[model samples]
Target: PNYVMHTNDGRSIVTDGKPQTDNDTGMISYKDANGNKQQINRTDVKEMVALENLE
Candidate 1:
């Protein structure tokens, strides 16, 4: 499912419809709104909300 992953710094990224967490680095990889590949550390994540529910 697609999600809006919000960071503690007031930034958010749109996932590639399916997001995955890296067990080793504790980071999550997803595509931003611009369709660029991005990764954020789990510790920096403030919230993760399903986009479907928001629609």
Candidate 2:
């Protein structure tokens, strides 16, 4: 499964795999399609939901 990360402004991010965070709060980090580290502010997110893969 993967995630469809939703932002406050109606933007969606498709994650590469599992989600990661700063472990302290107020931040989120995860790997993108190109395996680059993508970190985001906690306040910038509206919600993050997972989606199942058919395969």
Candidate 3:
């Protein structure tokens, strides 16, 4: 079953804002669901980690 986690700050959770300037050659910056800033590289991230599988 699929459950939804609702939040009042919808924009902060599912947003795709433009990458911040002055970033590395190919890195992208985005705000997470909690409004925390995060940077990801198009080539660095190769896998997705699932919470249920964490040991």
lDDT by residue for model 3 (1-55), tens? 1112233333222323333423555564555546676665534433332223222
- Candidate achieving higher lDDT, 1 or 3: 1
Cα lDDT computed for each candidate against the true fold: 0.76, 0.81, 0.40
List TM-scores for all candidates, in order. Answer: 0.67, 0.76, 0.35
Candidate 2 lowest-lDDT run of ten: 18-27
- When 2 and 3 are scored with TM-score, the better candidate is 2
Candidate 3 Cα deviation (angstroms), residue 15: 3.9
Kindly list the per-residue Cα lDDT of model 1 for residues 1-55, writing each as its tens digit.
7787888888876676676776666688777767777778777888888877454
Supply the TM-score for candidate 3: 0.35
- In angstroms, what RMSD does candidate 2 have relative to the true structure? 2.0
Clash count per candidate? 0, 0, 0
Q: How well does model 3 score by local distance difference test?
A: 0.40
Q: Tell me the alpha-carbon RMSD of every candidate.
A: 2.8, 2.0, 12.2
The regions of model 3 sitting more than 4 angstroms off are 1-25, 44-55
Deviation from native of the Cα of residue 5 in model 1, angstroms: 1.0
Model 2: CA > 4 A from native: 23-26
